[PDB]
Design an enzyme around this catalytic site. Structure first.
Site, PDB file in Angstrom:
ATOM      1  N   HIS B  40       0.827  -1.165   0.043  1.00  0.00           N
ATOM      2  CA  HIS B  40      -0.057   0.058  -0.105  1.00  0.00           C
ATOM      3  C   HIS B  40       0.956   1.087  -0.060  1.00  0.00           C
ATOM      4  CE1 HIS B  40      -4.080   1.791   0.300  1.00  0.00           C
ATOM      5  NE2 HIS B  40      -3.550   2.633   1.357  1.00  0.00           N
ATOM      6  N   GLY B 142      -0.743   6.162  11.042  1.00  0.00           N
ATOM      7  CA  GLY B 142       0.835   5.887  10.961  1.00  0.00           C
ATOM      8  C   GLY B 142       1.440   4.374  11.432  1.00  0.00           C
ATOM      9  N   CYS B 144       0.513   1.325  10.083  1.00  0.00           N
ATOM     10  CA  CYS B 144       0.667   0.429   8.785  1.00  0.00           C
ATOM     11  C   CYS B 144       1.896  -0.356   8.734  1.00  0.00           C
ATOM     12  CB  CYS B 144      -0.089   1.074   7.661  1.00  0.00           C
ATOM     13  SG  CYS B 144      -0.170  -0.086   6.241  1.00  0.00           S
TER      14      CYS B 144
HETATM   15  C1  LIG Z   1      -6.521   4.754  12.780  1.00  0.00           C
HETATM   16  N1  LIG Z   1      -5.931   3.462  12.182  1.00  0.00           N
HETATM   17  C2  LIG Z   1      -5.883   2.328  12.701  1.00  0.00           C
HETATM   18  N2  LIG Z   1      -5.111   1.383  11.927  1.00  0.00           N
HETATM   19  C3  LIG Z   1      -4.599   2.209  11.028  1.00  0.00           C
HETATM   20  C4  LIG Z   1      -3.647   1.965   9.901  1.00  0.00           C
HETATM   21  N3  LIG Z   1      -3.751   2.533   8.836  1.00  0.00           N
HETATM   22  C5  LIG Z   1      -2.677   3.504   8.415  1.00  0.00           C
HETATM   23  O1  LIG Z   1      -1.732   3.360   9.610  1.00  0.00           O
HETATM   24  N4  LIG Z   1      -2.526   4.147   7.265  1.00  0.00           N
HETATM   25  C6  LIG Z   1      -3.392   3.832   6.566  1.00  0.00           C
HETATM   26  N5  LIG Z   1      -3.451   4.637   5.178  1.00  0.00           N
HETATM   27  C7  LIG Z   1      -2.137   5.447   4.882  1.00  0.00           C
HETATM   28  C8  LIG Z   1      -2.410   6.846   4.965  1.00  0.00           C
HETATM   29  C9  LIG Z   1      -1.026   7.641   4.831  1.00  0.00           C
HETATM   30  C10 LIG Z   1      -0.721   9.049   4.548  1.00  0.00           C
HETATM   31  N6  LIG Z   1       0.447   9.101   4.628  1.00  0.00           N
HETATM   32  C11 LIG Z   1       1.194  10.457   4.468  1.00  0.00           C
HETATM   33  N7  LIG Z   1       1.120   8.006   4.433  1.00  0.00           N
HETATM   34  C12 LIG Z   1       0.265   7.022   4.583  1.00  0.00           C
HETATM   35  C13 LIG Z   1       0.235   5.487   4.597  1.00  0.00           C
HETATM   36  C14 LIG Z   1      -0.896   4.781   4.795  1.00  0.00           C
HETATM   37 CL1  LIG Z   1      -0.913   3.318   4.806  1.00  0.00          CL
HETATM   38  N8  LIG Z   1      -4.493   3.182   6.761  1.00  0.00           N
HETATM   39  C15 LIG Z   1      -5.421   2.875   5.824  1.00  0.00           C
HETATM   40  C16 LIG Z   1      -5.379   1.499   4.760  1.00  0.00           C
HETATM   41  C17 LIG Z   1      -4.053   0.983   4.810  1.00  0.00           C
HETATM   42  C18 LIG Z   1      -3.829   0.023   4.017  1.00  0.00           C
HETATM   43  F1  LIG Z   1      -2.607  -0.858   3.844  1.00  0.00           F
HETATM   44  C19 LIG Z   1      -4.834  -0.635   3.262  1.00  0.00           C
HETATM   45  F2  LIG Z   1      -4.488  -1.820   2.253  1.00  0.00           F
HETATM   46  C20 LIG Z   1      -5.983   0.016   3.166  1.00  0.00           C
HETATM   47  C21 LIG Z   1      -6.140   1.288   3.959  1.00  0.00           C
HETATM   48  F3  LIG Z   1      -7.484   1.866   4.012  1.00  0.00           F
HETATM   49  C22 LIG Z   1      -4.488   2.303   7.776  1.00  0.00           C
HETATM   50  O2  LIG Z   1      -5.502   1.479   8.006  1.00  0.00           O
HETATM   51  N9  LIG Z   1      -4.792   3.623  11.178  1.00  0.00           N
END
Ligand SMILES: Cn1cnc(Cn2c(=O)nc(Nc3cc4cn(C)nc4cc3Cl)n(Cc3cc(F)c(F)cc3F)c2=O)n1
Ligand SMILES: Cn1cnc(Cn2c(=O)nc(Nc3cc4cn(C)nc4cc3Cl)n(Cc3cc(F)c(F)cc3F)c2=O)n1
Lengths: 298, 298
Positions: B40, B142, B144
């Protein structure tokens, strides 16, 4: 999604050592060229009730101390006693020593524990300093010298060194200057903690967390002054709430739209009427080791 | 003193790095000369709904991956995709890689989670694989790429790499081969797990934990058969009990001297009559995220 979380333990793990005197052995903390451990290690089995630590200590040479960091034997160069700690000077500085300080935590505050056995780290968990200066830890025989800590940025603030289990199953220890938390002494005698009280600031934080999680059945429209809430709280063995605590709860109050004194009015009715079989965040007991900081973070 | 305890996380902390593509950043796992991370990361904010990962990956070269191990930058030497993970070959073999394995855990098994924020460890806690293949974790933005793991005598068994949070607040991810637990796909769309169930084998082990720690009040003089118990289990959304489950519980039965089907009779009474506002090991709900192995170790 609230749960107790510990700080990552790696910075403390590289500092855990084993200290052995004759056949008595426990954990010690290796920072720079000093090893800190409970002075109880210089007791033989017969010494453990009513020890005279100044006599036992003068009768020791450096060679009596067997200090093992993993596979390596370290040699005690010198030794001094500081309150209920020993400070063993050792021929080698720990290459893994983190940036650190020694702090004295206060009742109501939390820290992470690295439970250790024979110098080997076993598990990590969070717990809190109780009002009666004990901790409800999880500690088996051989855990003496395990260390409690918090981490801010890359600096480890050591705050607890485990000494003993009390007859009620709670735990007592010292800061890293060797001063005990509470009215305890390092002897194998039965010692009772004073009666404990509930950490009101943390129960209030937990109620806020439950509101953020969508549960507000315990809210009401009564009002209370700080003084009148504190009078009720003390009748139920809850800690009185200071205005500093009210300030600490400011962010949670603003996030939820529930004034601090209105949450106190909720708590007051909970204390006087109980929970009529209802639950809060799934439990019938009010949780008091989750801090306002924990709630805000999660 | 019985509580959820995480493994010491030092061996995993030394493997956490930050991986960035454009402005998209998350956590990676640095073992030998390879960084594993969720694919991702190659998504721009515009790509995160229904991306085509084969398309996005061919359009990148090694230069487009920025990998930071704290202050140090690691040069990407090659890259490939395996299921939902990127494998990035790097310049440097991590001098801190532990003895390790990749395992796929089964529902009901527990592991420690090292929650990380853009390459930096921030918390550690124990949790379990739910029967519906989600995790009830504590993860913020953050996280992931954060990893779940067990440790057996210096070997880290990695079992989970965090990907995403479902609408219900539970969490979904993959094993370290990049294959998801459960019915999920890595795109930013609302997805649902199946209906969850309570882990019967874990509740029973926790009841044994209580007996060992002195909490004996829920026991009764009665007994039941496997088939009659499972008639109760289905009615209350508990997993059916098997003879393998009973076989697993042998050592805990022997240590406490309570036959397994005797404990099932106690559990059947707890489910049918609820609890009396009393507590078991301090909690007021039936805990199901301790395995038989966890109870023995603690
Ligand atoms: C609240 N919460 C609970 N668990 C999570 C994990 N999570 C995450 O940390 N990040 C995600 N999206 C990103 C956005 C970004 C913005 N920047 C600048 N960089 C980013 C990197 C990521 Cl990965 N997501 C959403 C998400 C991550 C995936 F790997 C996926 F396959 C689908 C998804 F909808 C996320 O859930 N956050
Ligand atoms: C159940 N439990 C929970 N926490 C504890 C901590 N604890 C401990 O680990 N050890 C102790 N006594 C020792 C016996 C030894 C036997 N050998 C061979 N070596 C030994 C070393 C020690 Cl420290 N104690 C008891 C105890 C330790 C003290 F430091 C103290 F000041 C008074 C005490 F009664 C202990 O509580 N056990």
């Amino acid at each position: 999604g609230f749960r107790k979380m510990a700080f990552p333990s790696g910075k403390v793990e590289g500092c855990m050592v084993q200290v052995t005197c004759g056949t008595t052995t426990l954990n010690g903390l290796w920072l720079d060229d000093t090893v800190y451990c409970p002075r109880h290690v210089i007791c033989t089995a017969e010494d453990m009730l009513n020890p005279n630590y100044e006599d036992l200590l003068i009768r020791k040479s450096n060679h009596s101390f067997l200090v093992q960091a993993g596979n390596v034997q370290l040699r005690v160069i010198g030794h001094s006693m500081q309150n209920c700690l020993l400070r063993l000077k050792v021929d080698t500085s720990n290459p893994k020593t983190p940036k650190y300080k020694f702090v004295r935590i206060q009742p109501g505050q939390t820290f992470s524990v690295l439970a250790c056995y024979n110098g080997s780290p076993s598990g990590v968990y969070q717990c809190a300093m109780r009002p009666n200066h004990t901790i409800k830890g999880s500690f088996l025989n051989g855990s003496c010298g395990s260390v409690g800590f918090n981490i801010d940025y890359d600096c480890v603030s050591f705050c607890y060194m485990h000494h003993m289990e009390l007859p009620t199953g709670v735990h007592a220890g010292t800061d890293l200057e060797g001063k005990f938390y509470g009215p305890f002494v390092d002897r194998q005698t039965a010692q009772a903690a004073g009666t404990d009280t509930t950490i009101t600031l943390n129960v209030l934080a937990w109620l806020y967390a439950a509101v953020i999680n969508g549960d507000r059945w315990f809210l009401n429209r009564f009002t209370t002054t700080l003084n009148d809430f504190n009078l009720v709280a003390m009748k139920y063995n809850y800690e009185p709430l200071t205005q500093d605590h009210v300030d600490i709860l400011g962010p949670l109050s603003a996030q939820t739209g529930i004034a601090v004194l209105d949450m106190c009015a909720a708590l007051k009715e909970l204390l006087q009427n109980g929970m009529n079989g209802r639950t809060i965040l799934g439990s019938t007991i009010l949780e008091d080791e989750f801090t306002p900081f924990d709630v805000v973070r999660q």
